[PDB]
Design a protein around this ligand. Structure first.
Ligand SMILES: NC(=O)c1ccc[n+]([C@@H]2O[C@H](COP(=O)([O-])OP(=O)(O)OC[C@H]3O[C@@H](n4cnc5c(N)ncnc54)[C@H](O)[C@@H]3O)[C@@H](O)[C@H]2O)c1
Ligand SMILES: NC(=O)c1ccc[n+]([C@@H]2O[C@H](COP(=O)([O-])OP(=O)(O)OC[C@H]3O[C@@H](n4cnc5c(N)ncnc54)[C@H](O)[C@@H]3O)[C@@H](O)[C@H]2O)c1
Ligand SMILES: Cc1cc(=O)oc2cc(Oc3ccc(Cl)cc3O)ccc12
Ligand SMILES: Cc1cc(=O)oc2cc(Oc3ccc(Cl)cc3O)ccc12
Lengths: 284, 287
C-alpha cells in the first residue's frame, strides 16, 4: 500500500489537511508531522472529536490517520537541539527532529512513497523585507526552505523508488506582494529554485520526483496570523479567471495527482493552483 | 458521463492517441477529429484491425471510440472553404469538417460535451529556420497551429457544459531556442501559450470553462519525423541522456496528465503551461 508523511499540520484549516483528505480518497495511509508547540493541543482536539466532521471523506469512509508524531523542521538531528529540549512544550516529547522522525517512521512502518512539505515559518513575517534582521531572514530560510532539503536528505533512505515529493509555495517569490514580509518571499524563491536542483539529484540518483504547488490564498490559522489574508482572498475572488472559492481540497487533489504515478513525467515544476490568478496583469 | 473531442489524430503514434488511450481508461467517451488527407487511411486501418493492439489499454481493458469525424482546423465555417479544397480528391466526398460544422454535428448527435483536446500543429516551412521563413509560411504556421485553438474554443464553448476543460499541446522552443524547430513553429507555440492565458481569462469569467496547455517532451510521431531535412532522434536521445528522469517519455505519460487537467481534479488550475517532459526543461548545463 501507499504511505504519505505530511509535515506541517496544526489543525484542519490549512493546506496539509486538505492534502490529507484528498489522498484519503485514494486509500493512502497518512502520517502527520506536527510542530511540537501545538502537538498536545492537536492531540487533545483530536481525542475530543473536534476533527471528526473534518475527517469524513464520503458516505463510506473517514480519513485513515496511521500516526501522528511531533516534528520540528528547525532541527536536523538530535545533535542540533539547543534549553529548548527542556522547554515547557518540548520536554514531554522526544524524537522530533527530521532524522529522528525518519528513523521512527521507518522503524514502525517501513518504507513510504509520498512526502509532503507543508510548513513555513518566519519570526519577522510582519516586517517588510527591507526592515528584516539577519536573524529573522535566516530563520525564514531555515524553517521554510532548508527544511525541504533536509527532509529530502533524511527521507530518501526510507522511500521506495518512483516515490514522489511535494511542497507548497506562493507567487510572492516571483512578483511583489507587500505584506508578505520577513524573508518569506525570499524563502519561497529559494524553495522553488531548490525544487529544480533537488529534482535533478533525486531524479538521476533515485528516480524520485519532486514538485511544488504554488497555492492561492487560504484562510488558514498561520495566514490569519500575518488582515493581509482577507485582502488577498477578496482580491483573488474578485479578479481571478475562475471566481469559485479556493478550497484546501483544491490543492489536495492536485497534490494527490503529483504524488501518484499519473504524473510520472513531471518533476522539478512549480504548479500554480490558484484559480488562474497568477496569469493576470491588469485588473479589469 | 464524460465526452471528449480530440482534434488532431492521424494514427497511433502521436500524443493524441496517448491522450485518447488514457481517457478511455477512465471511461471518458472519445470522439476523434481526423484531418481529411489521412481520414480514409485511418478509417481503413481501423476497420482492418490494424489498431487493435494499440487499443489494448491493459490485460482486460480495451479502448472504445465513440466516433471519428473528418476535421480540418484550417476552416472556421463552410463559407471559409475555398473551391479548390472543396473539390479536392480527398475532401470532395467529405462534409461537416469545418470547426463550426463539426461542433454542430457533435452537438446534434451527442448533446453537450465537457472536454476538448487540441492536439494538432502544421507549418509549410518547418524545415527552414525562422530567418528564412516566408511571410506566407509563418502565417500558415500561426493559422494552423495557433489560431485554430482560438476558433475551436469560440465554436465549442456553446456545446460545452460549465466546468468543462480544454487542453492543447505546446513545446519549450517557444521559450528557449531549439534551432531545428523552424518555419514559425516556435512562434506559433509562443502565441499558443500566451493565448492560453488570455483565453483562460475570457472562458473562466464568462463560462466557468478552464483551459491549459501541456508542454511535452519529444515523441517520435509521424509529424516529428517530417521536421528533418533526424531532428527528433537527436531531441529524444538528448532528453533520455540529460533529463532528471532518464526513461523513455511515452505518449500515455502526456495522456495521463491530459486526463488529470481535463477532469474535475484540476478545477483550480487554468491558463497554465504544464511541462511533461521528464524534467528536461529545468536543466541549463548538460553534465
Ligand atoms: N495560506 C495560504 O494562503 C498559503 C498560500 C500559498 C502557500 N501556502 C503554504 O502552505 C503551507 C501550509 O501553510 P498554511 O497556510 O496551510 O498554514 P498552516 O497553519 O495550516 O500550516 C503551516 C504549518 O507549519 C507548521 N510549522 C511552523 N513551523 C514549523 C516548524 N518549525 N517545524 C514543523 N512545523 C512547523 C505550523 O504548525 C503549521 O501547522 C506553507 O508552506 C505555506 O507557505 C499557504
Ligand atoms: N512529437 C513531439 O515531440 C511533440 C512535442 C511537443 C509538442 N507536440 C505537439 O503535440 C501535438 C500533436 O503532435 P504529434 O507530434 O503528436 O504529431 P501527430 O502527427 O501525431 O499529430 C499532428 C496531427 O495533426 C493533424 N493536423 C495537421 N493539420 C491539421 C489541420 N489543419 N486540421 C486538423 N488536423 C490537422 C495531422 O493529421 C496529425 O494527425 C502538436 O500540437 C505538437 O506540436 C509534439
Ligand atoms: C510566519 C508563518 C508561520 C507558520 O507557521 O506558517 C506560516 C504559513 C504561511 O503561509 C502563507 C499564508 C498566506 C499566504 Cl498568501 C501565503 C503563505 O505562504 C505564511 C507564514 C507562516
Ligand atoms: C509541420 C507539422 C505538421 C503536422 O501535421 O504535425 C506537426 C507536429 C509537430 O509536432 C512536434 C514534433 C516534434 C517536436 Cl519536438 C515538437 C512538435 O511540435 C510539429 C510540426 C508538424
Amino acid at each position: 500500500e501507499d504511505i504519505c508523511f505530511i509535515a506541517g499540520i496544526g489543525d484542519t484549516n490549512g493546506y496539509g489537511w486538505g492534502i490529507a483528505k484528498e489522498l484519503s480518497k485514494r486509500n493512502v495511509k497518512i502520517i502527520f508531522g506536527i510542530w511540537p508547540p501545538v502537538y498536545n493541543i492537536f492531540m487533545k482536539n483530536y481525542k475530543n472529536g473536534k476533527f471528526d466532521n473534518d475527517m469524513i471523506i464520503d458516505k463510506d469512509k473517514k480519513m485513515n490517520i496511521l500516526d501522528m508524531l511531533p516534528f520540528d523542521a528547525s532541527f536536523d538531528t538530535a545533535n542540533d537541539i539547543d534549553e529548548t529540549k527542556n522547554n515547557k512544550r518540548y520536554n514531554m516529547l522526544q524524537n522530533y527532529t527530521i532524522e529522528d522522525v525518519a528513523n521512527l517512521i521507518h522503524q514502525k512502518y517501513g518504507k513510504i512513497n509520498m512526502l509532503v512539505h507543508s510548513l513555513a515559518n518566519a519570526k519577522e513575517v510582519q516586517k517588510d523585507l527591507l526592515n528584516t534582521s539577519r536573524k529573522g531572514y535566516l530563520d525564514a530560510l531555515s524553517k521554510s526552505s532548508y527544511s525541504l532539503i533536509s527532509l529530502c536528505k533524511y527521507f530518501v533512505n526510507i522511500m521506495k523508488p518512483q516515490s514522489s515529493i511535494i511542497s507548497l509555495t506562493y507567487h510572492a517569490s516571483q512578483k511583489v506582494v507587500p505584506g508578505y514580509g520577513g524573508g518569506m518571499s525570499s524563502a519561497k524563491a529559494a524553495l522553488e529554485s531548490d525544487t529544480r536542483v533537488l529534482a535533478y539529484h533525486l531524479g538521476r540518483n533515485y528516480n524520485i520526483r519532486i514538485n511544488t504547488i504554488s497555492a492561492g490564498p487560504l484562510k488558514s490559522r498561520a495566514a490569519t496570523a500575518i488582515t493581509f489574508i482577507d485582502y488577498a482572498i477578496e482580491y483573488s475572488e474578485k479578479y481571478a479567471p475562475l471566481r469559485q472559492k479556493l478550497l484546501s481540497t483544491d490543492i489536495g487533489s492536485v497534490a494527490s495527482f503529483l504524488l501518484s504515478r499519473e504524473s510520472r513525467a513531471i518533476t522539478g515544476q512549480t504548479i500554480y493552483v490558484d484559480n488562474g490568478l497568477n496569469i493576470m496583469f491588469l485588473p479589469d
